[PDB]
Symmetry: D3
Amino acid sequence: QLFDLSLEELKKYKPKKTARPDFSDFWKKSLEELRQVEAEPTLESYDYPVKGVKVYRLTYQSFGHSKIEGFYAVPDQTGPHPALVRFHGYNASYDGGIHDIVNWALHGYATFGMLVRGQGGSEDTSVTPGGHALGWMTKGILSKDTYYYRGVYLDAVRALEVIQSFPEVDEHRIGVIGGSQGGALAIAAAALSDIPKVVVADYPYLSNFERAVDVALEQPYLEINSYFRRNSDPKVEEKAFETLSYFDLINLAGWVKQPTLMAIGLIDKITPPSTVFAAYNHLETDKDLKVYRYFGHEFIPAFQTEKLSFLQKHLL
Amino acid sequence: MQLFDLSLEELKKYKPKKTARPDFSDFWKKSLEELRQVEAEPTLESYDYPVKGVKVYRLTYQSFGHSKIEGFYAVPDQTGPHPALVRFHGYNASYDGGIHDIVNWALHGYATFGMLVRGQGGSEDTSVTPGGHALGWMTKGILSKDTYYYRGVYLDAVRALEVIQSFPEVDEHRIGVIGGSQGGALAIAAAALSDIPKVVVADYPYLSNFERAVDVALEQPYLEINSYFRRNSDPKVEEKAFETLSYFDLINLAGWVKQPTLMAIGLIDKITPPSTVFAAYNHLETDKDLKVYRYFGHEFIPAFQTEKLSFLQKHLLL
Amino acid sequence: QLFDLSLEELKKYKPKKTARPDFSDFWKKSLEELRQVEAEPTLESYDYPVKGVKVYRLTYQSFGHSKIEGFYAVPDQTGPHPALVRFHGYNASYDGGIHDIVNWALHGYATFGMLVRGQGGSEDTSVTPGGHALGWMTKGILSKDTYYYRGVYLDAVRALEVIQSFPEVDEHRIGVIGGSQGGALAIAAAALSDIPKVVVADYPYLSNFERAVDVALEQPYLEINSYFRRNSDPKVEEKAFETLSYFDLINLAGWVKQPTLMAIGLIDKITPPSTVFAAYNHLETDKDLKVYRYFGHEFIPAFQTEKLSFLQKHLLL
Amino acid sequence: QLFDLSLEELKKYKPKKTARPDFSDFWKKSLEELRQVEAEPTLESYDYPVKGVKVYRLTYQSFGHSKIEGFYAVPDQTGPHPALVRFHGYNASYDGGIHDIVNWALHGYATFGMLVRGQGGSEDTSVTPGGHALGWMTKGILSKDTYYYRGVYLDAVRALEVIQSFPEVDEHRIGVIGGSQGGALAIAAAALSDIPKVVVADYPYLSNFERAVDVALEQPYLEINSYFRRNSDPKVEEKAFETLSYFDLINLAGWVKQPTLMAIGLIDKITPPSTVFAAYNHLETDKDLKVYRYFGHEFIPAFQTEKLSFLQKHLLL
Amino acid sequence: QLFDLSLEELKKYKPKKTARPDFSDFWKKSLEELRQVEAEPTLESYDYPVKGVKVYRLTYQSFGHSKIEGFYAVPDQTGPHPALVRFHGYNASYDGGIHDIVNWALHGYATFGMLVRGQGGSEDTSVTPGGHALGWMTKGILSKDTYYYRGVYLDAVRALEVIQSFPEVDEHRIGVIGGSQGGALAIAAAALSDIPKVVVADYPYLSNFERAVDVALEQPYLEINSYFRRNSDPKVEEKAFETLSYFDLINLAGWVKQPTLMAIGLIDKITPPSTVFAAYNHLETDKDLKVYRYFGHEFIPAFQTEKLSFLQKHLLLST
Amino acid sequence: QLFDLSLEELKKYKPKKTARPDFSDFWKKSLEELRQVEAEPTLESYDYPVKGVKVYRLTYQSFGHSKIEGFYAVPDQTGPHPALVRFHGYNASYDGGIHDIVNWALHGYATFGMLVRGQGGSEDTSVTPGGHALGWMTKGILSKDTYYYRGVYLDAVRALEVIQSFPEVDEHRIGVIGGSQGGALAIAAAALSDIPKVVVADYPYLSNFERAVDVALEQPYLEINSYFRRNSDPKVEEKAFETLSYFDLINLAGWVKQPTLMAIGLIDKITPPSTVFAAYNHLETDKDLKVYRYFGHEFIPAFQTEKLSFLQKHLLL
Ligand SMILES: [Cl-]
Ligand SMILES: [Cl-]
Ligand SMILES: [Cl-]
Ligand SMILES: [Cl-]
Ligand SMILES: [Cl-]
Ligand SMILES: [Cl-]
Ligand SMILES: [Cl-]
Ligand SMILES: [Cl-]
Ligand SMILES: [Cl-]
Ligand SMILES: [Cl-]
Ligand SMILES: [Cl-]
Ligand SMILES: [Cl-]
């Protein structure tokens, strides 16, 4: 049932940015550290019961010399092919989401499902500096350089640089997509790299953290609350939100210049409607936000049609 | 709650066959050799706290993987040597380093150090994450005994003991290790791997009889394992994960404990099932005793606190 | 956590059939009532954002002159093509499962997702004879002739005769698939018709009703318990179970001659492992049951690979 | 715990009517179709362990030639007797509610507990046009002519026609009572027929649908939400509410001319206070709404004393 | 869903009695203390919206000089009348259950709904000896003399002695009825007094306490477990069970010689089927137990017909 | 998660007092009845495994000639020592809370953990006048004279008089502390007696009863709601609240003149923030309220440090 701001209110909700003075400098330096790592991608054939598609396990080196992976599925016909980098949900990847990746290739897209560090797969070489609450949301939260998603965002940009380098891929028809965590990486990737032509984000996560901890009624935003319960020093809370600000979609959305499509369910308790309208309302670009009254944080049928139409129009 | 596991008559007879591989002993010898190669380089710094008669410090030391471990150390404000305790905390259950409990132990007469478990209540963990895993620490690096989360943790426990006994104010002959659940497992593991501790006190120890635990536990965190197999369905992965887990399973380490041990179990415990705790207990061959509480689960058990204090006082304080 | 019989007990679980002496006759009669209704199918183009596949809304007349419907998607290329009749779960059809029907066509199969009477769509002309518990499980439960699933099973048989007639369909490479209620429809269709070549049923429902009501921990089997609570006459419980025997998979499984592939998660509280093992253990045909210890009533990734390999082997071959 | 509009806000809550321009015609027309079916009621002796009262099984024909039934209990003494038609809750009728009907007869009332189509009993010859969410709330919801409650409301009116025709019944002393779904049938019956002298409705359901789906926290209003999730077409939502408007109490309330007593508990999560206050505020007749701060959707002891005193005053005496 | 022993097993379940050597002596002593208190009952008319029944608020003095009360409804017609004393469930009495009391009177029974000390009503003079767990279950549990149900059981006996003295009541046609706690009071009263002719007990409580605490999944048997958690002395648990044995139906049942009708739902999580079968299997009288697979601790429609037929046969239309 | 009034609004929440005109005389009368009971305290050595502390079982007579008890632990060194009377939570006392009591003595305070009547221990001689909801909240709620907390508050005052008379106790350095129920007792004790030097109360209970029953989401305030459901006479509700007003912290807080430290967790569903801010805002003394956004009704680690520093400052050093 409804629980967040009213719809009239959500449409006008646009929280002041929390980005620090050194926000762009942090990302410039981060992208430069990523650049210092040679990608050295590898592609190995992977048997799968499907006709018309060739499946591979793709790997590449990213920030911190971490070996990143995921399945890459390509239409079995001569290219150049339109492509997609699909990002998965938080702790929501089973067997690398291989079936859905294959189905995307069947729709006509060379598709790579980047597995998020320590989650669905992929190596995470970044150290754990100290205590944090159960989960990945607060790993390294006391510094923008050590935070879990610094490496993850850089991995998303690297996935795009790798896919763009493949001869069978048309660099002008690449899209990034995903839901919740996947939606945020899609948006973070587009804000950080001009490689992607379009972005589709279902109820994006990692947005408007300061309101999120006070409105969400389910994990994983609440990991932050759990963290502050275990580390009570007021300075810790201050520092954590400062760290979080560098990865917040309301601060990154301004850099997105790609046509963008988003979705939000009004009864979503995991990624509150307000947090998602906040990210949306910070985008200055070709955009559309589809609103579903009776849906939450789940697969939304009607949106799947919208998403397919949007991608087809821009990439097919 | 209500009874759910094997009957009490059956629990007393439950001694599951050991799952230790033929290189179980060599893996630990090797692991300890690697630990030995890291110089402790302990640091101590004064920490203010509103208590009279006890001095508190923040203690740090280097361990396996060149990881900096930390925790609060409280000492009676009187002339030593003092008997000591290394206390280990529960899974994801440390708040502000457990400082109030550590100080209380020092008021009882013990120089106490609450080792903070890597990335949970504190302490650095330099071990990389080799691949995907389920939410939590239970399956981090589970595909190899060399990379498994608890490898470094077990070593940090042993290192804590080596650091504490080197203190001049500590009576090396009167050190005890205590803890509940994850904490009780670390206490038993430290005792199996080190002759330093004199006594062991473990409240419903975790990390025991993993193969039964995944089929009987009804609450987290043993179930992170089940969650890991859901996300990684290759049969070989389940076989490999349990092989890794055997090197850290209390039913395989317990037989190495030579110290008088005090344990407790609540019969309605859904987190560390009675059967899993009796299994660890039944594999010990040492001066021992298991206190059974019919009406308690995974929580503070008042009657056992008295047993615990009387036990530590008997073997250490007095 | 684990809750049903132990794996070793499940493997041998084969409850005695509950079928009455007029069981074969009942279906014979029921199929004759169906044959009396001319299919008169209609096809209409339905736009969908995908390349290489053509979508349609198909309808046809079935038992009780009920108009049955569903989406039908065809690979956009030279046929004939192998085909699949996909059956959806109990009250689990959203927008006719159009997105999944289209994906089956992309895999190379002319696919029709029959919408079950009153659930995902389709008309149900059968009258409600008296009171029943909320839901479809007990509608008309006091007579094999008026029971909800009679019309449904027949509709599934009729779907096969319609698909079979399509010029772009290879009538010799047709499969029936579904999970739970859908898995039961697949097995029942293959038991009542020789049209399907192979069957895939994920944790089938409508199996071993008498044990089901004593072991399920969630809906919908419990609708039967709910019905007995509201209608306490002992003779009602007796009649109710007599009616259900005509639709129980443990009594229909023996007629299946097509190779079959099934799945079961051992922590499934909707279609308990024992009830699924009962249906499987009554099949006498080339069969295989994939067992997943850590899964329940849900999508099982590893079984999707098995499923795709199986259909490819027997159909797309 | 409190969750809806505050009490002072609730007393002032009067949502704008959603009745379409042809609201009145639709009902005059439905009532005409009902009149075409001859009631032809049957009464059969039904044994029950009670002195002073005689019980029967009453049946009659109604809208769509549906055979409606329920128990009829009468005071074992010379009439004319005052009478009551009691309507039951959604999916809440156990063994016809006989015990309560017998108790009402003991209080001096010839009582008939009409059983709602397919729920507590009674036949529903209405066909299911297409797909809908589990339950009766959305059956035939895409059209006012096919909607589940059309036949039910008409059965309610026919119930009154049948009872008043009985010789042992004082046609001038007939009341209609019920809780939730029953509170709504009693209000609808009164709105559609001038047969009842008074109305008692405990927290009536089927009221202010548009707000109900946004405030209800438990079933069954939420079946409408479930329906919209499964049939996403925006015009379907529009169509569904237009259909529902014809049966909504906020639109029927204005036709009730009988003295009316109602009740509402402030923590009711099934029939939210605002939806009940909505119905009450559209009533223009001798009325009274009893508010109970600490009660929910349940038997309210203090209101039973009110309901008995109210019926005693207007009917018995 | 099912959870206890198999029906086959339940029928055979008859736990050995826990009664102490002084079980009978304790009850003799308690009844004698009751006798020392003069009933001094009062009757005040009570307005109610019903025709053909007169209602009163009845009060009387009992054990510990406690004033017990409850509604007493009488059919408005010349008697004598058969009668019923109705006992209510644990913490489950709303406005004295007056509506059900009136209806019983409408079925032809002079009915008294005894309110249980401190719950639905009635005063309770017994002091609280010491700490106990939230609720009435462990109040005064360290001694049979101070235990909460000692006063309540005696109150049920006094109720029968008071109702029987009424002119409009046929003393040879009185029944005791109730569900759970109330079904327990019914049985206990019949065991302690020969005043009632028959007994109707829906899924009776306070039975087989030692098994109860290990099988029950909901309150209030679990208040005992709560009590042990807060008072860990092993000797406290030993004494608690000794105290409870004096009020346990498995020990009292043997004293009942009145025709008795009982009911149990197989999914009852409050009064486990085994605990109810234990009570039933210890009765040696004309008895019947109706078993209902699909019901739990709740109103069972089918058993209401059974209950009404049983009361009619033994009370309204006989003796 | 957050649910009450926002922090800005909580800071200014000060409900109008509900104290009756006879409020002061009621307490004066009560205190005098307590005075007529001679304390006749007893001390008994109690063995416990701890060095540096001697423990005893202390008992004393109080209001209504009830024998109150609890553990008393004293530093094993020459005194006088500062002292604390510790009050426990509602139904939350296990084995007299002896481990915490001993720990306070190790921190340097002669500590007495009073067991509250019938809960953690202690005899309660007051008679139950009639029916009430499960629990202690509504026992004797129909009269200020018979209400459960009357004997309890007096018991607390008597505790202070006994401990202060001990020759090893420095009567000028005594503190009262406790959480929830224990916090209300510490406050009430300080309001009725000038013996305590300071007060520490974690999320105090028994405060702003009229709002509490409309905002609490868990037990035990809801016992009052339960009470009203079982006793529906409007006058009973009126009387219940008049009785409660004599024990409500918003009315007693004005009498506290001791430095006071309080705490509250913003997600506390047992003692809602507004009810605790209500109590705080009525104090006119040296006071501080520590606010913890991410904590509820539980041990707050950060507050323990504040607590210990505050006690050390006023009592130890
Ligand atoms: Cl950090
Ligand atoms: Cl959600
Ligand atoms: Cl790994
Ligand atoms: Cl537990
Ligand atoms: Cl039927
Ligand atoms: Cl499941
Ligand atoms: Cl429709
Ligand atoms: Cl409700
Ligand atoms: Cl006691
Ligand atoms: Cl139950
Ligand atoms: Cl009172
Ligand atoms: Cl809380």
